């Protein structure tokens, strides 16, 4: 934290650094405050900022939300294995709801989440106009949470493209709402559903939703070995109907934009 504070203070005067990555290193509250102060300084020109597995305090979430309320030239942000409460989630989605947001991508995989904040998530999705990619991971949204999310999605005001759900403890009930939302979602492009229990009838419903001409879902991440013969035949029929649909287990392999510049 002292080293991080010194590094940020030194970087305060810099203006030619666009991409910055800091992961797995403990960061103090004062470090986050100094980083936000640097971001508020003009001529920063820092597009992508990546932070994972670095503990972030509740007050730092306030600073981040205040920056996000009036933010430019800051497109991609990542937060993973970070303790984020439901109230912090509400604060973040309220900050995103403001029209002066240019954040294209937001990643929140292992942040502990519950079903209560899902209504505010649906509201912010409906209101937001610039969010393109949204990802969720091991956080357990819950059946009611996914139902509310799909109710917000089916209205289809949002122009988001990529949605990611994995090990969210899904059931067969939300599949009807998901199919209904997809059936009127020409904008949606990519989708993932892995490590979630899906019954046979849910698979038929989802395949039928895929086959509808309105849906334009191209990238889909599922494991074909888990399902029965009829589901495999239906997916083959989907591939026959649309020549540009590909189903592969490794969903993260596909990159529409440079996301693993730091990983390489």
């Amino acid at each position: 934290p002292a080293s991080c504070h010194l590094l940020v203070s030194a970087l305060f005067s810099n203006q030619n650094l666009t991409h910055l990555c800091l992961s797995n290193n403990s960061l103090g509250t004062e470090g986050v405050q100094q980083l936000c102060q640097f971001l508020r300084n003009p001529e920063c020109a820092l597009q992508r900022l990546i932070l994972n597995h670095c503990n972030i305090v509740d007050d730092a979430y306030g600073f981040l939300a205040m920056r996000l309320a009036n933010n430019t030239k800051l497109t991609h942000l990542s937060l993973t294995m970070n303790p984020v409460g439901d109230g912090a989630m509400k604060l973040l989605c309220e900050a995103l709801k403001e029209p002066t947001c240019y954040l294209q991508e937001l990643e929140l995989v292992d942040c502990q989440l519950t079903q209560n904040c899902c209504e505010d998530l649906a509201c912010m999705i409906t209101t937001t106009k610039h969010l393109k990619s949204l990802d969720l991971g091991n956080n357990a949204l819950g059946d009611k949470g996914v139902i509310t999310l799909c109710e917000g999605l089916k209205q289809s005001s949002s122009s988001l493209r990529r949605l990611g759900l994995g090990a969210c403890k899904l059931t067969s009930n939300c599949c009807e709402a998901l199919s209904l939302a997809i059936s009127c979602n020409p904008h949606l492009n990519s989708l993932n559903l892995v490590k979630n229990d899906f019954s046979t009838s849910g698979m038929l419903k989802l395949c039928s939703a895929f086959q509808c001409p309105v849906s334009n879902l191209g990238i889909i991440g599922l494991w074909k070995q888990e399902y029965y013969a009829r589901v495999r035949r239906q997916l083959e029929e989907v591939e026959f109907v649309k020549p540009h649909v590909v189903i592969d287990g490794d969903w993260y392999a596909s990159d529409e934009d440079d996301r693993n510049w730091w990983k390489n």
Binding site: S23, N24, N52, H53, S78, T80, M81, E107, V109, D135, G137, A167, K169, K195, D197, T200, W223, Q225, E226, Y228, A229, R230, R232, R233, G249, D250, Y252, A253, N260, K263
Partner: protein, 367 residues
């Protein structure tokens, strides 16, 4: 409504070319894109590329790896229902155990369907009626164990010698080998129907210790250098240390116990009950047992990962389920048509073998 569809599995390029050449000859004599699975390279690895991850791991935590999906590569054919399988990753020799006969196969050769084994071993030739139920392998791959119901003893085969031969009969005339066990020590362990456990030294072939309990309590047995675990229909749970030679803990359940498991890197004890409840217990603090997973179907087999992260279950309901240790939640699913009796795992963590019906199947793990 499973409605299952079956297709040739490997679709290997060599097989495709051979099939193509065969058709041309038939066409000549008659007057009178494509997807192929990667072969098992040398019987050791598949040589695939790993899958991407959302974020990088910690510098200290590189070794921890978890699987995603299972893909089958080969099918092993035996006309009778198989009961147990063995991996022997060091020698690339898979052993298949059935009620009547045992066969040995090698994974070097590439073929879709394997019908001809490298070695065929039957215990029914020696005696009039031989029913086999149990089998076991040693880590050093120097011994092979096979127990039977009406078979008067247990036969040991050694793979170090150029030829396979019987070491000792080690008779148990009145006792049927319901349970067979072995340890790092040379010492042999076995359980039988009448609640009796008799113990022999392989070097000298003598009975050294006998244990007695209520009937049906020897269905399960767990071996450790300082822990012997015993349970059955009664559901009493007993842990014994040979050193001070007394039962350490007694535990009671509402139903019978069938499946037990242990973790190498740090002790955890897994329990499988008749009503389908998975109970986890730690053998360090020794305080309390807890249950986190429930399955409607009865669970018959269980196994743990060498890394110490995931465990896969095989049960009556024709399903294969794999979980993780932090929460017990399942991470991927692969069902099969037949009731899966057995299960297996590899020390390297690259292959996996499971068998439900008369024939056996070999799967490949992806990381």
């Amino acid at each position: 409504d499973p409605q299952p569809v079956w297709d040739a599995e490997p679709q290997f390029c060599q097989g495709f070319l051979i099939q193509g050449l065969w058709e041309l000859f038939m066409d000549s004599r008659q007057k009178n894109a494509d997807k192929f699975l990667k072969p098992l390279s040398w019987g050791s690895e598949v040589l695939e590329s790993s899958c991407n991850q959302p974020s990088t791991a910690l510098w200290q935590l590189e070794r921890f790896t978890v699987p995603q999906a299972l893909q089958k590569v080969r099918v092993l054919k035996h006309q009778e229902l198989l009961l147990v399988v063995a991996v022997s990753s060091f020698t690339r020799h898979v052993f298949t155990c059935s009620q009547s006969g045992i066969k040995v196969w090698n994974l070097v050769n590439q073929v879709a369907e394997d019908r001809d084994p490298e070695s065929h071993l039957k215990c029914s030739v020696q005696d009039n009626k031989v029913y086999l139920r149990t089998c076991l392998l040693s880590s050093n791959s120097r011994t092979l164990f096979a127990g039977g119901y009406n078979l008067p003893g247990v036969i040991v085969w050694d793979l170090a010698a150029p030829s396979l031969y019987e070491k000792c009969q080690l008779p148990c005339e009145g006792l049927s080998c319901q349970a067979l066990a072995n340890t790092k020590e040379n010492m042999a362990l076995a359980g039988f129907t009448d609640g009796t456990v008799r113990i022999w030294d392989l070097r000298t072939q003598e009975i050294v210790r006998n244990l007695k309990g209520p009937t049906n309590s020897a269905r399960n047995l767990v071996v450790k250098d300082d822990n012997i675990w015993t349970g059955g229909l009664d559901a009493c749970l007993r842990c014994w240390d040979l050193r001070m030679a007394k039962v350490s803990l007694e535990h009671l359940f509402q139903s019978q116990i069938m499946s037990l498991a242990h973790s190498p890197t740090e002790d955890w004890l897994l329990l499988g009950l008749a009503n389908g409840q998975h109970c986890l217990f730690n053998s360090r603090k020794r305080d309390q047992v807890l249950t986190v997973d429930t399955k409607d179907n009865t669970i018959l087999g269980l196994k743990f990962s060498p890394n110490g992260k995931w465990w896969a279950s095989v049960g009556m309901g024709n399903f294969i389920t794999v979980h993780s240790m932090p929460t017990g939640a399942k991470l991927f699913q692969v069902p099969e048509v037949g009731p899966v009796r057995c299960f297996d795992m590899t020390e390297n963590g690259r292959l996996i073998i499971t068998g439900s019906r008369d024939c056996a199947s070999v799967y490949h793990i992806k990381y």
